[model samples]
Target: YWKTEAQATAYIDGIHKHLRDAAWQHTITFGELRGGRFITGASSDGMGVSNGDIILQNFDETHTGVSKFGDLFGRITNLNLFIARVTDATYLSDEMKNFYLGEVYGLRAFYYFDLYRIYGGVPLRLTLYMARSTPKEVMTQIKSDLNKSMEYFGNMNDFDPYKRGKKVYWSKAATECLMGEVYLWTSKVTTGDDVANPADLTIAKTHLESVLNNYNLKMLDDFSQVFNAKNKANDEIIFAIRFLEGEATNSNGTFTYNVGTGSTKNRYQANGEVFGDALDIQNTGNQTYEYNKAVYQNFDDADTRKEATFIASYNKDGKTGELSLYGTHVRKNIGYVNAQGARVYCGDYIFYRLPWVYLTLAEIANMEGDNAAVAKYINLVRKRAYGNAWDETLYAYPETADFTTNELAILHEKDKEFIQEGQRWWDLRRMTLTKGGTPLVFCKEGSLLGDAPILNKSTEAHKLLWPIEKTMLNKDPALEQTPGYK
Candidate 1:
């Protein structure tokens, strides 16, 4: 009785009936999904350094834990059940069935993609009896499921991408965006020789290009509006997790600055001018994570992102009366103050957006030897950030820079653009810019970074991806300790 088509149809109906559940919403936005922020913070995560971040400050095997990995497995179980249970729902019109299946498949791919990135590979349970899959196998599985998601989504000519929950809901374009991300991964780490695969770059470009041109996505002109709670799901946003005031807050108290009560005799911006309230609001700031001066220095003075994404604090030197830098805090996704004077961190946790498409396309173009395209894509983002201060001669990427120069330019752009968006560490790993060069994560010499490379290739290769926790291993013998951690 429970295994009938009526059952399948009934299960799927329940899913769509209240499709706005935000349990998983907290996963991507607040802390869990952005777990990369902790470990990868040691590297140039979020396009910034995190000396103030507790885990990154003293990252080692002891810090290598993902006990929260259990919650992920539990959620994954629901997704798996949904996929398997809904397959035979003959009562669902073919249209609705594909539509329902499409969403689940994409969400499942999303989970494994995070797992693959965090653990390199884990138990790849498409059906979930249990067996750990290699990163390669899991990646292949990700591609297939992503393709299936795209295929099923393509079947829905009438699907409203924003019908249920704005950009929180998955759609064909989001699938393409996810496709762009996966191909970017394969292209970057192809054969792990520390360079891109020539062909994979071409493949990546197709998805990124479609995400750019084919979809109705737009590149928002203003950098500040990208994550604004009032302006979420704008044309630039492809897939974002919803976090409304009544719904949920992203718990970004630690990410914002705890400017404290330290009196300032004088203030200075990272750009050597008097700092302004550009990033200030009635906000929460516990001061757990901080971006250092080096990351702030990497930004061009004219770029709006330099101001919009971070705020620097200074302690006035009583003797010189000049400002001494304290620490920088992330401003993006810090949320807005509500009617009751409560600072709410309810900003949408964007997963994929249009600017991501442009930047990733830039990465693909850089690998494709299209220096012109690389500069064009990068300049699109730079022009928006620089606004009135933009000058093609000084601020834009030139057409004839070396591959390393172009790569660094792209990396810098991404760092500025994706600050605290949970992307920079992967960017560093993918871009060494030396072409078959040691990965940037492992490189320490003249990398143009403001902070020292926390990882050295001599001993920390295993740290590139995290190790599985002992708890997970004890629960399931099918799992093996991540390499080197063993």
Candidate 2:
């Protein structure tokens, strides 16, 4: 039992380490590991660039088992413990205390938001120190704890623009963005709309507005800057984990290897290399740049992001890089290298960035029927992407800066900014619900993907939340497994 702040912090830190470890392990099993081996090869159903299609892979029972426990439960528990430790005051300072507390609180909110979106009425575990020991009990506790967090988070101040370097630490602004997200998700699961009944979109708007008032965040002038490692932890990061490069760990694999198709290890395909080493995409894991020519062309040619974010083409060892696809490869992070200056491809991950806060504020404003507010938030992000002088004239012309009706536009902008941020699928799923309205008839065709595209329309029912493992449920019938978990 810890009574003082020092004692509390140390104990929480130890437990927090476990939670973080579990999260890494979870990503390894569910995502890519083994430098593009078994899981990668198995994901695409044998489609796309010889098996580079794991991005939209389908969910299965095996994947589901550790799904709920490792990713959701594990991370959330760590957050709760961190919060608990923060509140145990023995000694405190403004910056250290507030920022640390904010990080823990914000992270917990983020973890729960994922749970709510993936598994409605999920078993929330608010306290890692608690010995609840049962499923129904855990679920009830989690929901109760989450609601309390919403209130605590709602009252927080917006982010302080001055505190830029400590970007990973949560701020009032980041909390505001997260709470709006929380309310939207909360409203969705319990009700149906982004702003469910009883929960006013106004509250969400307030959260977003605070960030807008202070940060005035803009998009990176260059699209590739969004993914560049050196450019990270900049004005765009509202809330994100600052990953130090080359910190070798198996539990938490590099985000570069999984999401961004770079130079290190390729997602191992069944037939082996998508293209042999010399003529390959050069995914050294350190090279954040990859090319998907087709998706690149979909954007208007003038869209600066397309040019800045993608690599048209490149070559190494006199072998020209050509994938016979749409455009070129992605070129966000620079090429990776070793201590000896030898190139490698593994880079760090960006958890939450400024663009998300901007887009979120826009969504909240639109939902609240404040078109002026919406335009203010949206335009700020759009204009700044290029370090161009801010101009009202640059906004979507015909659509109008005052345009508030098109939710897709807001989401699209978010998509462009957050590409490869490891958030697209979940974000899309949450926005599809309507208040007492028919679930938005969203669908994606199976054949649309050439060689590999893991997700499609049928995936809507593939279990948003990873199912609790059968073996776990068998041990304790009270575990109350997730529905549709075979």
Candidate 3:
């Protein structure tokens, strides 16, 4: 059954299909939406600051019925076995064979990384067995898998960077980007010998540099142009979950529900609509997942990302800025009708991009105490944010920039750049570990509008990692709940 290279290729493509499915994206959304950065406008939902009980408060013991980690576990196990079976297939060209193997390893790393990012020490299963391993062991396996993928990968020119139907498929650049991320996480977060390893920082820098050197990518001049609905895959995106418009494969339902205002009638009612400016799209039917004022307050007036990232105003029945809404509504995933009159609700979910790489490099530089390097990479992103209006005095950092200031700036950039992208919670987690600080993830002040006692700080050691879903634990008795969940 696995005799032909084409069949093997199809098998790998099936894995890609799994990645693009709703289960993966929805599972990721559950972790992020409940992570407590944005306020869900439906105060009745009990997710607002006033409720004083964010979704995460119950996440440890609640059952949401979605287990994407299990889905990925099964897929990765099958892929590993498939690769082993085809490791020495003579029917396929050497390039094809190696590419498949490389892709499999990279995918395995990706799925495992996702699990570990949320759960910390996940049960590492390289083969078809339920192998118990610590977080450090899991992270080590991640590194080894990434290295093996890198080893099998061909040169930049040899691989197709943007395959038409396979835009979501793995590439050498994507793999390297993943490696850079893996190294960064392993250096700071992993337990045992891997924690705070300076060598990993160096490795991260090199891996990120490989991505820059190999691919012709840069930040888009127009920030809005990067997320245009007409084209989901742009030069800025290094890796993304590809979705074809109008196909079953095309579904950003998670984004639609979390970021979309499901309906205008639900939003434009009394005490709901906030006046700003009118646009062609009223963001009708937006699933009201509003943000606290802190979301808008966080941005400087000069930063261009502010306006593009959130809807500044609201409109009523043919009235511009005539109504008010509860809080800020996200504009990033606001679904729209294409020129073809078909509603395009889904777009590519970007996994890695040039701006993020720049920030990662800057972070690495900060870790290495290379202030010059830190300024160099961080400013590259800052200057882009202030493009055309970029000023040497206002935008550029001086040689004597304070290390703490630089680190804070980079983290802020990451927050603004990746809002609603599901990176906030994990970024907060990483910082809590590396920065020796606690993250105020839940609403401290009252209801994102009034004042209340500071509730939860993510610094609680147990909160750092999510509890294994009850179903997963029941399925495997050997698997243990993340500490303190029980």
Q: How close is each model in CA RMSD to the real structure?
A: 5.2, 7.6, 5.0
**Candidate 2 lDDT over residue span 1-486, tens digit each:** 345656644654454344344443323333222111122222121222322333334344544534435555655655666676666555754444555565565556555554544444455466522222332333344344444444454544444423534554456666666666655544443321123443646666566666656665654556566655566656666654444456432211222232344332333222333422322223333222232334455455556676555434322222653333322434444334456654443334455566676677666555555667666666666666534544455554223433324345565566556544544454445444232322222422111122432233464444544555566666655565555546
Native-to-model Cα distance after best TM-score fit, residue 31 in candidate 1, in Å: 11
Estimated TM-score per prediction? 0.83, 0.67, 0.82
Which 10 successive residues of model 2 have the least lDDT summed?
34-43
State which candidate has the highest lDDT: 1
Kindly list the per-residue Cα lDDT of model 3 for residues 118-193, writing each as its tens digit.
6667677765226457777888788888888888886633335335353467777888888898888766664433
lDDT of 3 at 387: 66
The positional error of residue 25 in candidate 2, measured at the CA in angstroms, is 8.9
Model 1: CA > 4 A from native = 1-62, 68-70, 155-162, 190-198, 258-283, 445-452
The local distance difference test score of model 1 is 0.65
Best model per TM-score: 1
lDDT of 3 at 259: 22
Pairing residues by index, what is the TM-score of model 2? 0.67
- Pairs that collide in candidate 1 are none
Relative to the true structure, candidate 2 has a C-alpha RMSD (angstroms) of 7.6
